[PDB]
Structure formats: structure tokens, C-alpha cells
């Protein structure tokens, strides 16, 4: 599903994500999604020239699996829905996802 999106980078370390965001210019809203190294994911986002990281964890509600960054308070069927929702709505983030880190 999410493997068809250029903002997904797979299993890369935290330091690698900061280097990539550095490679593309440290613009506000520059973001990527990566897989956790130890079924979770991490959204890495640049805001005010600082790189913050947001854990994404899965759970299941009566047969349906969802993803969340706030322990179930805001739910998404997949990472794409999480990404496009947060291109218009801040949610818990300090800024919008405005630029893809390929």
C-alpha cells in the first residue's frame, strides 16, 4: 500500500532520516515516513529547521486494523490516509506536511 509512495523510505535509521531531510534543504513541512527497526512506523518531519519524529503504532478494533499517533484517539486505515489527512489538518503535529522527501 504505502510502498507506492515516494515519501515512504522503509527501514531506515533515525540518523539517516535527519541526513535525508538535510539533503533536501530543511524546508518547513519536509517529511518522510519510515519503518520501525524493532509493525510500527515513524513520521519524520522538519519544522523550524529542527527534525522531529512521531511514532505510529497499529491496533485492531473488532477485526479492523488501524494506525494512530495518539494511542487510538485519531485513527487511520493505512499510512496514506494518515499522510493526506495531515496535509490539511495539523492534528498533534506542529506544522502541515507540505513537501515530500523522496
Amino acid at each position: 500500500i504505502h510502498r507506492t509512495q515516494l515519501w515512504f523510505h522503509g527501514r531506515i535509521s533515525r540518523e539517516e532520516s535527519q541526513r535525508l531531510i538535510g539533503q533536501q534543504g530543511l524546508v518547513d513541512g519536509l517529511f518522510l515516513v519510515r519503518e520501525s527497526q524493532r509493525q510500527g512506523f515513524v513520521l519524520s518531519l522538519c519544522h523550524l529547521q529542527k527534525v522531529k519524529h512521531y511514532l505510529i503504532l497499529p491496533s485492531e478494533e473488532e477485526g479492523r486494523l488501524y494506525f494512530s499517533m495518539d494511542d487510538g484517539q485519531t485513527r487511520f486505515t493505512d499510512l496514506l490516509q494518515l499522510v493526506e489527512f495531515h496535509q490539511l489538518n495539523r492534528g498533534i503535529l506542529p506544522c502541515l506536511l507540505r513537501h515530500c522527501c523522496t
Partner: peptide, 10 residues
């Protein structure tokens, strides 16, 4: 909070 991450929620 998720310790080690920047998540901030109630």
C-alpha cells in the same frame, strides 16, 4: 508521550 519520540497528546 511516547518516550523517545515527539508525540504530544492527552
Amino acid at each position: 508521550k511516547f518516550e523517545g519520540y515527539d508525540n504530544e497528546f492527552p
